[PDB]
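Supplementary Note 2. Why include the ligand at all?

Several targets in our set were suspected to adopt different conformations when bound, so apo predictions alone were not considered sufficient. For every target with a known small-molecule partner we therefore ran a joint prediction. The input for 2-amino-4-mercapto-butyric acid is given below.
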Amino acid sequence: ELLKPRTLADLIRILHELFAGDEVNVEEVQAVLEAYESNPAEWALYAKFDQYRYTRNLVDQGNGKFNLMILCWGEGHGSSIHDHTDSHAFLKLLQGNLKETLFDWPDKKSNEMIKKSERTLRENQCAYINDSIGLHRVENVSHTEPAVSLHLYSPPFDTCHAFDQRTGHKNKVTMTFHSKFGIRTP
Ligand SMILES: N[C@@H](CCS)C(=O)O
Ligand SMILES: [Fe+3]
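The joint prediction is reproduced in token form.
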């Protein structure tokens, strides 16, 4: 039974219940993520920015089946075009706006990757992607406002592929944590 998370801590407790089994009800998880009203005081500890690129800040290591982190995007910071390593990926906005651009999986033939669509993800909204849906790029295109997003991945993964927009060629990237549980992890 899905109740509104009152705080980030409450959300985390609810997620441990939603991931107590072996499968994932995506619509339920997205609904409860969207229902949490971002409260900056609750997540300030994890919102550690870097001047030059976006940072990944682990919030909860989950129960073996998921993990929850906060990404901090300076003005103009964005990602590669990337996949999600056969995992579920949820993205909720905590502050600001992000542009999400969708791409199809490339064919083996070298070719420009043409965007299939784009949208602006706004404060408190929760987006979802998986590899069956496609690839995406996420960017803070603002010149004046940093963005903060809450990401849930299930199962957890620490590698993915970046895709070259000119060719569709991919390269494996290992993702690192800027911090864990509020502690900077150089
Ligand atoms: N998957 C990316 C962010 C957009 S989902 C990452 O964890 O670095
Ligand atoms: Fe992503």
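The domain at 1-186 is CATH 2.60.120.10 (Jelly Rolls). The chain has one domain: 1-186. Comparable summaries for the other entries are listed in the accompanying table.
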